[PDB]
From Swiss-Prot:
It is a multi-pass membrane protein. The gene is rep. It is found in: Host endoplasmic reticulum membrane. Residues 1-167 form the Macro domain. It catalyses: Thiol-dependent hydrolysis of ester, thioester, amide, peptide and isopeptide bonds formed by the C-terminal Gly of ubiquitin (a 76-residue protein attached to proteins as an intracellular targeting signal). Signal peptide: none annotated. It comes from Severe acute respiratory syndrome coronavirus 2 (2019-nCoV). Inhibited in vitro by GRL-0617. This is Papain-like protease nsp3. Changing S164L: In strain: Gamma/P.1. May form homohexamers. Interacts with N protein. Responsible for the cleavages located at the N-terminus of the replicase polyprotein. Participates together with nsp4 in the assembly of virally-induced cytoplasmic double-membrane vesicles necessary for viral replication. Antagonizes innate immune induction of type I interferon by blocking the phosphorylation, dimerization and subsequent nuclear translocation of host IRF3. Also prevents host NF-kappa-B signaling. In addition, PL-PRO possesses a deubiquitinating/deISGylating activity and processes both 'Lys-48'- and 'Lys-63'-linked polyubiquitin chains from cellular substrates.
């Protein structure tokens, strides 16, 4: 048993809710919140901008030190950093950005990072400003992640479409 509340169960291990991931993170304080990161960990907008804003820019400060030491992530890759006031840890995961021409096939690799964590609160990777079809992202999530994932979908119309179209 865990403290996630109000989720619809899609599969044995995937759950979904219409929620703002920032407010969900602040309420639950999960062990792991997933950020929709880019390779430079520049948290300017979308989920990343919102998570970073909620940390009063501490996520960005930590991220800039990470990049200065390690260089950029790979598309499809991840790193574990602090969750600040939102979670114990933040798993920064880079899904492909279709608006940059990045290979949508890398979305499966991106979701494989979730399997290193028993339970996660997460957005749909490559959705929103990353330009992929969220219905496809949900399908890849369900077919790739084997650990317990609680998906937060900000947009109510999209949430309803994801549920109603789920196979
Ligand atoms: C990209 C995915 C696909 C469907 C969807 O809604 N996405 N985004 C979110 N998902 C969950 N919480 C969020 N909080 C946010 C706060 C923001 F400023 C901006 C975006 C989000 C957001
Ligand atoms: Cl977005």
């Amino acid at each position: 048993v865990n403290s996630f509340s109000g989720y619809l169960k899609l599969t044995d291990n995937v759950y979904i809710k219409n929620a703002d991931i920032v407010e969900e993170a602040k309420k639950v304080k999960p062990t792991v919140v997933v950020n929709a990161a880019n390779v430079y960990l520049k948290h300017g907008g979308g989920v990343a901008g919102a998570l970073n804003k909620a940390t009063n820019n501490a996520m960005q400060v930590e991220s800039d030190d990470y990049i200065a030491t390690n260089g950029p992530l790979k598309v499809g890759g991840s790193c574990v950093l602090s969750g600040h006031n939102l979670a114990k840890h933040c798993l920064h995961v880079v899904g492909p950005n279709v608006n940059k021409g990045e290979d949508i096939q890398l979305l499966k690799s991106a979701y494989e990072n979730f399997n290193q964590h028993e339970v996660l609160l997460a957005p749909l990777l490559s959705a929103g400003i990353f330009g992929a079809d969220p219905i496809h992202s949900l399908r890849v999530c369900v077919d790739t992640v084997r650990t317990n994932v609680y998906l937060a979908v900000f947009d109510k119309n999209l949430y309803d479409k994801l549920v109603s179209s789920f196979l």
